[PDB]
Amino acid sequence: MASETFEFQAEITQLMSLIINTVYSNKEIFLRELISNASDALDKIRYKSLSDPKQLETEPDLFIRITPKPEQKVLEIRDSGIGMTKAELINNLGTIAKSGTKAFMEALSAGADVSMIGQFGVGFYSLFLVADRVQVISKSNDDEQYIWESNAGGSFTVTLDEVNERIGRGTILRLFLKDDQLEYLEEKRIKEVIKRHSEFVAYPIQLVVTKEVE
Amino acid sequence: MASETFEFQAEITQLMSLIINTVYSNKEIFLRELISNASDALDKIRYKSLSDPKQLETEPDLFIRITPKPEQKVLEIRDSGIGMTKAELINNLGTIAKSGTKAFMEALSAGADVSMIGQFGVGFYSLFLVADRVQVISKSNDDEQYIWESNAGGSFTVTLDEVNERIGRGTILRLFLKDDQLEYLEEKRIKEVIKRHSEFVAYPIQLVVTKEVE
Ligand SMILES: CN1CCC/C=C\CCCC(=O)Cc2c(Cl)c(O)cc(O)c2C1=O
Ligand SMILES: CN1CCC/C=C\CCCC(=O)Cc2c(Cl)c(O)cc(O)c2C1=O
């Protein structure tokens, strides 16, 4: 119920401000970045399960699932990967200095394509190209379900999850899309972006479509 | 977190035992019954909003939404209707003697078609034709989100909801389908049942389909 507030490491806030304000054209690369991250999480739970089979029992199916929520202007990207504990959301998503953050900003100033973000290990922050707010909902086998939330400012919140659907195991990236980026709520657009940049994915990519009967 | 246990009124337990054990053929009528109930809830919030417009602001869209969850063997029927308080789930779904329950059982003994269940005002209990367990998740503007749960036995539970997605307003009927009734997880089957028995519905009926990309 009670939210804990944490400060972002200085260089991460600069990077987030850069990306949320950019007039850069090829904004669709955010999906490639989030599918790769999702695929890495799925590799980690699969690799871990080789010597610990019981790790998969909290969520036996290994998948990536994309759910547009047009009514809320939300796009969700779920995976049944390793997930993150409260301590892993705090360290990995904001407080610890990520190797590559300042160097990616340096490559960007020199002329690099924002598309290179994933080679610097900070591809997660590409979501701010299309979203002005994000909730990272995660369930690790080692902890309770938690919500990490950011709006590209200097601080983020972490809250024990008592409001969202139960994840058996994994992470949900809940993107609150910008008014000009509502095209990523469309099935044809989503399918087009997936086929173009995520051809070699070892896990099924599912698209959740809502349709009116007759 | 803590579940409260309540006893069913004697005649409701008889009716539920009757329906969960029946070898009756036309089991698909359960959907017609749940769509009518959903449509009545939607009428009640719409009628109430005529003199109280602010009632619709917790969930402005009026819809019926069917979500098969094949992995869990679950079928969900959501509406953004009036919803029920903790006291309304306890009174309306089990403790208060429903007018028509014993008379429907009397009509059934005499030879009536189970399809008549809705004319006796107890159509909700037709869900036990296809499910051996049910969770009624409901959010009224007047109360918190609660979970009513039954497996056709003599008692039901009511629990404050800290585990499911937030309903803005309305009810979710979460059916845990029987091993022989997993056909109602299929889009073609669901669409066929809706077109045959629910032609005159004033609200959009949405079907949530999950599909693997490429
Ligand atoms: C991949 N992991 C585990 C964390 C692995 C360790 C360090 C990297 C931290 C950043 C992430 O990659 C977190 C994450 C994101 Cl952003 C995602 O979009 C989907 C996921 O499923 C995860 C995740 O739960
Ligand atoms: C219609 N109401 C309000 C309760 C109205 C008063 C008395 C009747 C009680 C039984 C119901 O009909 C409850 C209900 C069911 Cl079972 C349903 O499948 C969908 C709904 O949305 C509701 C609901 O929330």
Separation between Cα atoms, residue B214 and residue A62, nearest integer Å = 17
Pocket of ligand 2 (CB under 6 A): B 34, 37-38, 40-41, 79, 81-84, 92, 124, 138, 171, 173
- A162 near B CB under 8 A: yes
3-state DSSP assignment of residue A213: coil
The architecture that CATH gives domain A1-214 is 2-Layer Sandwich (3.30)
Contact B164 A162 (CB under 8 A): no
3-state DSSP assignment of residue B110: helix
Resolution in A: 2.3
- B204 near A CB under 8 A: yes
- A213 near B CB under 8 A: yes
The protein residue whose alpha carbon is closest to atom 13 in ligand 1 is A37
A109-116 long-range Cβ contacts below 8 angstroms, 24+ apart: A113/A26, A114/A19, A114/A22, A114/A24, A114/A26, A114/A29, A115/A26, A115/A29
**What tokens appear for B173 in the block?**
């009927």
Q: Per the annotation, does B43 bind a ligand? A: no
**What tokens appear for B113 in the block?**
């078609």
Domain coordinates of chain B in residue numbers? 1-214
Among A61, A195, A210, the residue with its CB nearest the CB of B208 is A210
Query: Residue A93: which of A146, A44, A131 has the closest Cα?
Result: A146
How many angstroms separate the CA of residue B47 from the nearest CA in chain A? 23
Chain A residues 78-117 with CB within 8 Å of chain B = none
Q: Is B124 in contact with B35 (CB distance < 8 Å)?
A: no
- B166 near A CB under 8 A: yes
Separation between Cα atoms, residue B192 and residue B177, nearest integer Å = 18
B91-119 per-residue burial string, b: 16 or more CB within 10 A, e: under 16: eebbeeebebbbebbebbeeeeebbebbe
Separation between Cα atoms, residue B210 and residue A212, nearest integer Å = 14
- B165 near A CB under 8 A: yes
The one-letter code for the residue type at B66 is I
Opening angle at CA B84, ends B79 and B87, nearest 5: 165
Separation between Cα atoms, residue A21 and residue A41, nearest integer Å = 29
Query: Residue B164: which of A210, A167, A14 has the closest Cα?
Result: A167
Contact A194 B204 (CB under 8 A): no
Contact B204 A212 (CB under 8 A): yes
What residues does B146 pair with on adjacent strands?
B138, B160
* Chain A, nearest residue to B66 by Cα: A210
Helices (H) and strands (E) in chain A, counts: 5, 8
Separation between Cα atoms, residue A51 and residue A40, nearest integer Å = 18
* Chain A, nearest residue to B208 by Cα: A210
3-state DSSP assignment of residue A176: strand
Q: Give A71's contacts in chain B (Cβ within 8 Å).
A: 61
DSSP string covering B126-195: GGGGTEEEEEEEEE-TTS--EEEEE-SSSEEEEEE-SSSPPPSSEEEEEEEE-TT-GGGGSHHHHHHHHH
Contact B212 A191 (CB under 8 A): no
